[PDB]
Design a protein around this ligand. Sequence first.
Ligand SMILES: *[C@@H]1O[C@H](CO)[C@@H](O[C@@H]2O[C@H](CO)[C@@H](O[C@@H]3O[C@H](CO)[C@@H](O)[C@H](O[C@H]4O[C@H](CO)[C@@H](O)[C@H](O)[C@@H]4O)[C@@H]3O)[C@H](O)[C@H]2NC(C)=O)[C@H](O)[C@H]1NC(C)=O
Ligand SMILES: *[C@@H]1O[C@H](CO)[C@@H](O)[C@H](O)[C@H]1NC(C)=O
Lengths: 500, 48
Amino acid sequence: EEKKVCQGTSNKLTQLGTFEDHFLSLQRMFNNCEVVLGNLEITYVQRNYDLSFLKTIQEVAGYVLIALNTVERIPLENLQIIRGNMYYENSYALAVLSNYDANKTGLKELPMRNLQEILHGAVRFSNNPALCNVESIQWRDIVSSDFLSNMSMDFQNHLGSCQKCDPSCPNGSCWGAGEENCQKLTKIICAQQCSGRCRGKSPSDCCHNQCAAGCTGPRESDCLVCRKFRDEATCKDTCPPLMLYNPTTYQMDVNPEGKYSFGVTCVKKCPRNYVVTDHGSCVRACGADSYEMEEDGVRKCKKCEGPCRKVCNGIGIGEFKDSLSINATNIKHFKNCTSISGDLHILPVAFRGDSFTHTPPLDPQELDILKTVKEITGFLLIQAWPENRTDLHAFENLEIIRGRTKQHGQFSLAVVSLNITSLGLRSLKEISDGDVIISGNKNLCYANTINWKKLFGTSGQKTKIISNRGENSCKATGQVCHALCSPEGCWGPEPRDCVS
Amino acid sequence: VSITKCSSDMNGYCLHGQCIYLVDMSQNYCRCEVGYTGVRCEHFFLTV
Ligand SMILES: *[C@@H]1O[C@H](CO)[C@@H](O[C@@H]2O[C@H](CO)[C@@H](O[C@@H]3O[C@H](CO)[C@@H](O)[C@H](O[C@H]4O[C@H](CO)[C@@H](O)[C@H](O)[C@@H]4O)[C@@H]3O)[C@H](O)[C@H]2NC(C)=O)[C@H](O)[C@H]1NC(C)=O
Ligand SMILES: *[C@@H]1O[C@H](CO)[C@@H](O)[C@H](O)[C@H]1NC(C)=O
């Protein structure tokens, strides 16, 4: 079982074709998902459409958006925490907006009974003409005190169709109507002796500081949700240090419980992809004066002596955080980069230009600059390429795709909807992590000849090559690997492209 | 009506779709062509 995870969606309030196609995509993304790393968006959903899969969702790290729904009930019954790592509209971790219909009734049921803490952000309710009993829910326990002012919740439902809360219910604050759908106070009912949350009002019934929403006892394992970091069933403020402080130590206090830091959890060993620092953490890139070396085949931060190579950030991160694709404005910063500390996107908008971003068109010849790069720490996405060129000339010297960051959290290499006849990625020797997708390239041929398994390093990697030019069509056009290389395939028609 | 036709100034905003106006939010968003994801439908949703 472990924890089932979904990447989430960041499409804001954008429709995905028809309503049914949108609902389909939603159910693919959030089927069986116990923990959402990203943003949970429930938008453009229609009445009498099954939404029961949402019962499985326990956590949402980003924000929860619920909008443009004609549905009667959305069943986030087991959702218990909203970490608030990402805000919607820069100040709302939970947003329920404009849930109306041609008929007066819109959204009426939101039974988030287990919801107890929103670590960061505020809540906004607007244009909801059918919501029931969410008005009674008091948000002092749920929302952080610092973000309370930013809350802008206003309910507009005079239907009176909603029922009343149960007598066993604290201050009449209920989520829906049953006794199970009521406020659970773990913050306000606490004594002055508790720090943070509490299981009961008595001093003996307090929660540990790292217990997040609630606890069943004053123990780290009894924490229902982890606040900061997680070790086994325990929740901790920090991953246990490999070396800890001691009052008097003949040698460094090596901790038998010391574990490496990876994301929200603490693992025993960092993956081969990430930089294992001496402090004990899985890091994506070395900082200042530190560059990447392999001591025993694992990456580490060695201090540069004086001058040090430039850390060329990828598109979508750093200075180019909101940049959709490489374009004329940002292509100059990649002049002499031998490595891409990030992920590289290429989209058709770059060649046409975008007035909304005030972006000029991109020159095809300028792309040749990318020939200097040999290692991409993140992922490569190619949705556009110059029409005159028949191969990915710029990435001919690319060697290793580390795949530390992947598109949609899955694909490290993507080449879709290109007219190129051959890939031409001759120098590519290792795809350390992430899947590969080659689809919709009408004139591309030499893809299935290559054995992508030898390129794959991490176990479980898969390849998906479809909708390219057919093998029969390419064979009839003489577009098959050169005779000088019988096995292992090739990257193009000429002998230079043969694999070894 | 929830959806309104965007003004012609929002012409190329939707890379793979058509601009739509949400009157309650008073904002411009996209109707994506099938298979495309993102606010501006910028990235192709990669099938498994
Ligand atoms: C071509 O490449 C260039 C260079 O990388 C790239 O330019 C970038 O465009 C984005 C979008 O216009 C810029 O990001 C903006 O920065 C301003 C700075 O004040 C912000 O105010 C903007 O805020 C918006 O987004 C916020 C959320 O992030 C919202 O909360 C807010 O309400 C606004 O909607 C926005 O962040 C970025 O600064 C430039 N960078 C440079 C160096 O010019 C361009 O986008 C690329 N073109 C394409 C088509 O990819
Ligand atoms: C969701 O996951 C369950 C569990 O494997 C599966 O039985 C079901 O078919 C899935 N639903 C869809 C729509 O794929």
